[model samples]
Target: AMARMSPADKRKLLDELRSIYRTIVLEYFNTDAKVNERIDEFVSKAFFADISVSQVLEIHVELMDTFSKQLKLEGRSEDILLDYRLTLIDVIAHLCEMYRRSIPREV
Candidate 1:
């Protein structure tokens, strides 16, 4: 059986994760500066908070869909946001590295 978090705790964590992810995606699209650092911060929080990679991906998909719908309303092309997949890939890779590092090495 899996451990469960209190509803309040889960809400707080999801809120924080969503906020950080929005910041990361905007920063990624806006400029090249410190994006990696922001991503590192995100991964660190996610790792320590016991957030799963799949959960992170769900947040990303939700945000992207939201952005795409907004663009559609604005009569703009939604294709531009397709590049955001790279951010997802980077986050997953960072999370994977963290998991790898946490594992004990075989002698």
Candidate 2:
């Protein structure tokens, strides 16, 4: 689906995805009450608003899955960085799972 976008748009999406990764990293490590509010603030910005919530959830799962595989390839690096990434992945997964449970499915 992303292949249809113009090169510039694709580049912009990649940059935005990288920014989300950084945000998740910060969200995991920082205890400030406003950190989640800050992440929530950016949720509706730019390419984020370009897709439906389900699509965004799917993308989040794909991102987390890819990262998980990479972590496995690195011999399962047991460290603080991995801890943060795993926690962020779970947060995204929980949101997606909740949405799935709340919505009715077409038969």
Candidate 3:
């Protein structure tokens, strides 16, 4: 069975996902909050919203491109942006784990 989410609701969820992910990537090392817990919360919302890993990757790529453009405009190298890939990996791993647990096992 599929969840009945409206397009606008899905879009809103995606926007929230993007915002949270941006924070996760940009504040990777400087945050004092519980990042892991925040990731779990993001994954829970994503799973409920029927968000796919590909969509998540698309967000990551889009954010990276934005960062790249901003860095270029500032005459800075984009090397540091490479580290943000860890954020993508972390999110994907959590999402995949959620998917796994959501599946039913036959006895």
- Best model number under lDDT: 3
TM-score of each: 0.77, 0.44, 0.79
lDDT per residue as tens, model 1, 1-107: 78876767855877777787888777877655687777777888788777778888888888888888888897877666787788778777887887899889886
Clash numbers, per candidate: 0, 0, 0
When 2 and 3 are scored with TM-score, the better candidate is 3
Residue pairs that clash (backbone atoms under 3 angstroms), model 1: none
**What are the runs in model 3 whose C-alpha is more than 4 Å off?**
1-5, 102-104
RMSD of each: 4.4, 7.4, 4.4
How do these models rank on lDDT, best leading? Answer: 3, 1, 2
**Candidate ordering by TM-score (highest first):** 3, 1, 2
Candidate 3 residue lDDT tens string, 1-107: 89786688888888888888877776667658677777876788788888878889998898898898888897877777877787788889987988889889966
TM-score of 1: 0.77
User: Residue 42's C-alpha lDDT in candidate 3?
Assistant: 78
lDDT of each structure? 0.79, 0.55, 0.81
The candidate maximizing TM-score is 3
Model 1 alpha-carbon drift over 4 Å, by segment: 1-5, 104-107
